[PDB]
């Protein structure tokens with residue numbers, strides 16, 4: 308994974324609805340700090356759909372790779388309205404960036 312490439316992908320496709328830094332604001336979507344190793348739908352203070360709260364998996368590289376390829380397929384009923392990122396390489400780079408930005 309290439310975090311530098313990932314950072315650019317984040318700005319292009321995710322930043323309009325998400326922040327990732329510690330203490331960052333919730334916007335259309337939840338601030339994502341602390342995401343890795345945590346069960347779905349647990350960002351503090353964000354109002355999730357029951358679907359996002361109930362998916363039940365632990366976010367990590369593997370689960371984010373599947374989710375980001377097609378969000379509504381992975382979480383039917385989600386209010387995250389976004390097509391997904393088809394390219395495996397792009398998802399890997401994006402996730403690399405997310406791991407770095409949301410864990411420090």
Ligand code: HEM
Pocket residue numbers: 317320321322323324325335336337339342346347348349350354355356358359360375384385386387388389392401405
């Ligand atoms: C960009 C490609 C992108 C990423 C990365 C991303 C991630 C993401 C995660 C990991 C969650 C779940 C967090 C958790 O379970 O705690 C999540 C949730 C929502 N998102 Fe998102 N998201 C990306 C892009 C976008 C875009 C462009 C929007 C807005 C149009 C958006 C919105 C949302 C919303 C809303 C949620 C909450 C969904 C719910 O059902 O509660 N995301 N995202």
